[PDB]
Design a protein around this ligand. Structure first.
Ligand code: MG
Ligand code: MG
Lengths: 257, 257, 257, 257
């Protein structure tokens, strides 16, 4: 019973931002659990390459181009997955950016709007498009990649738009959880600490940043993408049947202090 | 000494959305505490009427036209206040809208983006413009009107964009609190329950909505604008000297259950 | 109207732990707002000196001996105040201790139990005894001194029993808020950061502790007792009429990071 | 890789309150993941029955008498497991009681103190005794059974001591997470909604209670023990390697409204 609940055999999953980093780890975890996974990403090349690596390991993985700033792109990408796969059982929404080391008094409208558009408006576009399909199935699960930045404020790097966008993502996901609970849908978010990715490594290589991050973390380390993916895979599975609207802290204790 | 900490004599306060409802109650409380208050609102006629009423009560109140969806408008209005008054000591940010009874699957891009733009992007525009002056002064206080909707999901009315945008406001304010703490600035938010205003008439006059609201509230009532204004005035005052980044629940116990 | 809401003229307030530090600041603030205040404290000589000092300033104050580890003591002290003054309008519950720099693997039963008994069990004894009178009145307000330690875990000093006891206090107060809301009673807590007091001054003179506390605080300072007393006085007043079950953060931004 | 992270083969787990209901479900989940499990419970005959049933399925399960109000009992039971098994890898702390429908103004000292003693003091006793072994090992994981009652206040049933005790449990576990993170130990809690058990059956058959619980739940149902056990098993596993100090909501959306 209990180990079987963790399986995702034959379930169709779309992972936005799935071509690299946390997204790619989530793709890999879902695929290992038996899911049919579609990488939805802005980079057509990256996605196609990732698909090859994963098929190489025997995974049922495909790709579609998606731009989360563009409603038409998102809806076209979701429709074509629905077309080819017949169903969408799982959405993992990882698409996001972080514009950091930009003081609140300095940030431009363009920086503000871009940050909110990708992280928060993109979450709306993604979840709405997939949600409509899940509603007709009366079955589905969404996992969003939130951030501890939605709950606490990072130091010393300034990024108020990021922090606000992720708090928005958390409460948006909770709203969906409430609205869609009677219709067989669950929606949760993970809120990770710093994860070593191609992008955060620039922060990691700057001692003023990295030393503060480590000093502020009880476990004394950043996380790795597979550690976020394991939680995401769990939340996507029937093992998590009683969980909806949860902001799950995956942060090495950062928010405890 | 304790009672004198509550006074705001000669302090310059800008209240966005100050022409009616919670905004106007905040303007009144600030003025009664001794502040020189500027109503910053979209509706010039409504603002001018409010100014006339308050001036007849012996208060020092004026108004300025401000559209929080427009950066130029916000920057010009804030500069005008600074030029005419000499300082900006306090910002109370009330400007906001709520598009409700719109299901998450049905909400248009237009509805989502308008709510995020006024509630959240408007908060950035207003706090940055005022914040720059406060940073120069190495002194200032911001109070945002957040919402219990930033932490819990209202029922039965669907309003996922509102809920997300207000969670965004809370965490934005907290980011400003952290960034600006060393510079003599405090920033807090109030998170109220339902308040009787023109904007909640549609719910209060609809039994399916109102009865649910009351049943969900330990005090068994909605709040009045003056009850929010009292907390806002407190948070704007030196009595709240140790409070920054606080999301202050003003909700008749609604979030307790 | 707004400034009048802050007054407590002729209201009867009991302050447990009121003889020094945060308790005494709360006593002072309440007295300055017009309340008749009873210091309820274990140390008779200390309470008596405090009463005599405040009386010299024109305040209406008195004291009663109360041991919050002892139910008979608490009940007798509260009954005595009720008979002597005719009513109990306000309870501010400050009595507490902090056993710190004791690792979780080392803490004895005696150390654990004493901390829980004073901080949490003593909160139940105090609140029940006053609460019964407030229920008869259909009117009352409780303010507990909680702690940021109920929400986050202090560093580097170990004090898991204190942290647990204060989280217990916060949720106990919220429980009372919910149960007693229909009967004209409000109950809230403050959650302060480090406050300079006779007790914490030892930690403040220990760089390993003090430097960590300052480094973790956005305002870069500890608080002063009067800054907590201001928030407590506000929460005890009709100005806070819409607030019940609130855990009000008074922490110089400590919990924001 | 991802599926192997969920395995607990040959790891030693003690489950307090493990003979029935949630505890028994946790025992079963751990055993199905390959753990060596010891039921630690108040009554010997009840635990023995469970052992016999699980051994019939080929599981490696045993039991020990443990009374969590009694330090000697707890220390002796933990020592017995250590001497028989050579290590303790996992503690799931489920021992607890709920005295409910007792108004705050009515609750006796005996009722308050017993609830705090079993739920909170017993958590300290259990966690210290096991924690000492885990510190020697520089390896261990604790999962406490908290409650949504630590975060929100149940209705209509009055149970302030239970609510307080569980908030205490949450913050005690977070304190252990912070203190023991550098030493290879993780500590998290689950915060469930109503779970159908032999004890909650009586409430579920009282319409005044059950109808309110259902109406308060987005999923419109209570949970089953296996749904809590699945989350506990995940948290105990290396798949949860990045999670410590998390209060994980498993509440069918109850705390979202
Ligand atoms: Mg922190
Ligand atoms: Mg609720």
């Amino acid at each position: 019973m209990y180990m079987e609940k963790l399986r995702l055999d034959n379930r169709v999953a779309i992972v936005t931002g799935g071509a690299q980093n946390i997204g790619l780890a989530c793709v890999t975890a879902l695929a290992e659990a038996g899911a049919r996974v579609i990488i939805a990403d802005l980079d057509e090349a990256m996605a196609t390459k990732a698909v090859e690596d994963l098929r190489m390991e025997g995974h049922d993985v495909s790709s579609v181009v998606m731009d989360v700033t563009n409603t038409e792109s998102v809806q076209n990408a979701v429709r074509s997955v629905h077309e080819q796969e017949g169903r969408v059982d799982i959405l993992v929404a990882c698409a996001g950016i972080c514009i950091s080391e930009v003081k609140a008094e300095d940030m431009t409208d363009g920086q503000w709007l871009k940050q909110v558009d990708i992280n928060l408006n993109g979450m709306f576009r993604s979840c709405q498009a997939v949600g409509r399909i899940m509603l007709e199935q009366k079955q589905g699960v969404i996992v969003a990649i939130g951030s501890m930045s939605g709950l606490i404020v990072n130091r010393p790097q300034q990024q108020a738009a990021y922090n606000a966008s992720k708090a928005g993502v958390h409460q948006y996901i909770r709203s969906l959880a409430a609205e869609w609970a009677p219709h067989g849908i669950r929606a949760n978010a993970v809120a990770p600490t710093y994860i070593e990715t191609t992008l955060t490594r620039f922060g990691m290589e700057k001692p003023e940043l990295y030393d503060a991050w480590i000093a502020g973390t009880p476990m004394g380390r950043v996380g790795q993408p597979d550690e976020v993916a394991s939680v995401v895979q769990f939340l996507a599975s029937d093992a998590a049947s009683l969980m909806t609207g949860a902001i799950v802290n995956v942060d090495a204790g950062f928010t405890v202090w």
